[PDB]
């Protein structure tokens, strides 16, 4: 159905240890395709998916330049925000930026975004309409007046509604085998009685793409979430994902507990039962 | 493809 292309940027300052660390990563849905790390060998935008290696020398030259420009605004941004909040020169601070665009099942434009963080909390973000800004505080309000005068919103709106979705589509057909695959979960359930009075049923979901999955517990139809451990969805490292979910069950009642699995690679949703 | 016009905060 829907697809997306998102770019992630992290810049962290190194007080008395020189230039900042800068890392840039690009995704199409849940697949990383490009990278830049200020600490890597090459000093260029590097490929991370097979289908992007077929872009020629002008693409990489271009993306190296642009990613270095980003890195430069970030280098200054750390000094600017340090000034903005009157912080000392002795501490390490972090800037995060994420932009990107969503398309529908028809591949036409759906949504565009550009948000910005300072020390792990909101700073400024482009509003839904791509014309306006939300400033997080009195400092951030200064950035907002500056970005009105700089016409940032206008150039972002041209990118997000145009170039972001033009390039996503190029990527989506170049990596037909990879990006338009949908991988059904492999499911099984385990039983581990930790004591003589209680038992732990653990539903598993393994080998799935994309990462969006929903695992729920239930006793005889009604949605039990009271006695429930659910881990964060984690990467297997091969491109697919993993997730488990558990219940602490008063033992002998394991038959009237059901586990519900929702994923877009599954036609009908799955129920699971132990016996 | 990256955004081409990043501006200082």
């Amino acid at each position: 159905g829907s697809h997306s292309m998102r770019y992630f940027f992290t810049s962290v300052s190194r007080p008395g240890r020189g230039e900042p660390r800068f890392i840039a990563v690009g995704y199409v849905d849940d697949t990383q395709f490009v990278r830049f790390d200020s600490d890597a060998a090459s000093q260029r935008m590097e490929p991370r998916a097979p289908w992007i290696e077929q872009e020629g020398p002008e693409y990489w030259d271009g993306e190296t330049r642009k990613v270095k420009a980003h890195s430069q605004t970030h280098r200054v941004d750390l000094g600017t925000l340090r000034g903005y909040y009157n912080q000392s020169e002795a501490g390490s601070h972090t800037v995060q930026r994420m932009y990107g665009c969503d398309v529908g099942s028809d591949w036409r434009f759906l949504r565009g975004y550009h948000q910005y963080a300072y020390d792990g909390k909101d700073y400024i973000a482009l509003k839904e309409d791509l014309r306006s800004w939300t400033a997080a505080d009195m400092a951030a309000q200064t950035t907002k007046h500056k970005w009105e005068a700089a016409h940032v919103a206008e150039q972002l709106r041209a990118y997000l509604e145009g170039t972001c979705v033009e390039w996503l589509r190029r990527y989506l057909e170049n990596g037909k085998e990879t990006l338009q695959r949908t991988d059904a979960p492999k499911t099984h359930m385990t039983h581990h009685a930790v004591s003589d009075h209680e038992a732990t049923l653990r539903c598993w979901a393994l080998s799935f793409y994309p990462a969006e999955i929903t695992l729920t517990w239930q006793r005889d139809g009604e949605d039990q979430t009271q006695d429930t451990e659910l881990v964060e969805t984690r990467p297997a490292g091969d491109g697919t994902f993993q997730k488990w979910a558990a219940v602490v069950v008063p033992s002998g009642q394991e038959q009237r507990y059901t586990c519900h699995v929702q994923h877009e690679g599954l036609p009908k949703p799955l129920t699971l039962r132990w016996e | 493809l990256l955004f081409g016009y990043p501006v200082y905060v």
Partner: T-cell receptor, first 110, second 116 residues
Framework: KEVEQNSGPLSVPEGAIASLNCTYS??????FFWYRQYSGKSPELIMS????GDKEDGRFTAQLNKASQYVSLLIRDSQPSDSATYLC???????????FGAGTQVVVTP | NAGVTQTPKFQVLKTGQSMTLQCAQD?????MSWYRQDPGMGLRLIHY???????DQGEVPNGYNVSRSTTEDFPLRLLSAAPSQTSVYFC??????????????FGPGTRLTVTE
């Protein structure tokens, strides 16, 4: 030769439409410009276009088609004071070099 | 052109003379370029600078010289004038990272003629 432009000279009478073609080769280009330059002076910017489709400003209309890599400029109701050579200019980013064409000389006859 | 200014308007030199073409800019831009313009070659890039302190060469840098100590001025020195440097020269200005406005604006030009 990254930006290919209409050869020239183009001759239109007054009140007509002068249409100008431009073809670029870098697929990742993002910003697109038309410059007007009278003989013996500096190139002066008249039209910028940032996204696919048409943008109108007075007598000027510029189209962009990024799929087939094409910029245009249409001059509705042509004055004789439009007699200039018109430059197509193309860039990728803040830091990218601007890529100019050769220019097409437009002559408006009264 | 309320932003980009250049001095002088016109110049004659003989072979081996030195001169500097002043270029200034008003709009707090980071990215400045020097172009030469010639009948068969179109617009060609001489030297360019994306910030104060720093400069880099274009496609035709040979025999030209450039510095950028301030963000306002981008002077082009010619050290030993040669008859092939006979051209119109354009100072150009672009914001770079201080604004998202993509547009590059030109100075009014210096007509230079180098004779034997």
């Amino acid at each position: 030769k990254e930006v290919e432009q209409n050869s020239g000279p183009l001759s239109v009478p007054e009140g007509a439409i002068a249409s100008l073609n431009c073809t670029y080769s870098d697929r990742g280009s993002q910003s697109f410009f038309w410059y007007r330059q009278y003989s013996g002076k500096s190139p002066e910017l008249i039209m910028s276009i940032y996204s696919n489709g048409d943008k109108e400003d007075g007598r000027f209309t510029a189209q962009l088609n990024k799929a087939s890599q094409y910029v245009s400029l249409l001059i509705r109701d042509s004055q004789p004071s439009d007699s200039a050579t018109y430059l197509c200019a193309v860039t990728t980013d803040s830091w990218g070099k601007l890529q100019f064409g050769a220019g097409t000389q437009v002559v408006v006859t009264p | 052109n309320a932003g980009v200014t250049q001095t002088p308007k016109f110049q004659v030199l003989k072979t081996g003379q030195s001169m500097t073409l002043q270029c200034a800019q008003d709009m707090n831009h980071e990215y400045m370029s020097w172009y030469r313009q010639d009948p068969g070659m179109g617009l060609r890039l001489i030297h360019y600078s994306v910030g104060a302190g720093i400069t880099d060469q274009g496609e035709v840098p040979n025999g030209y010289n450039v510095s950028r100590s301030t963000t306002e001025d981008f002077p082009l020195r010619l050290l030993s004038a040669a008859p092939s440097q006979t051209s119109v020269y354009f100072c150009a200005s672009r914001p770079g990272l201080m604004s998202a406005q993509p547009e590059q604006y030109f100075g009014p030009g210096t007509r230079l003629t180098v004779t034997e």
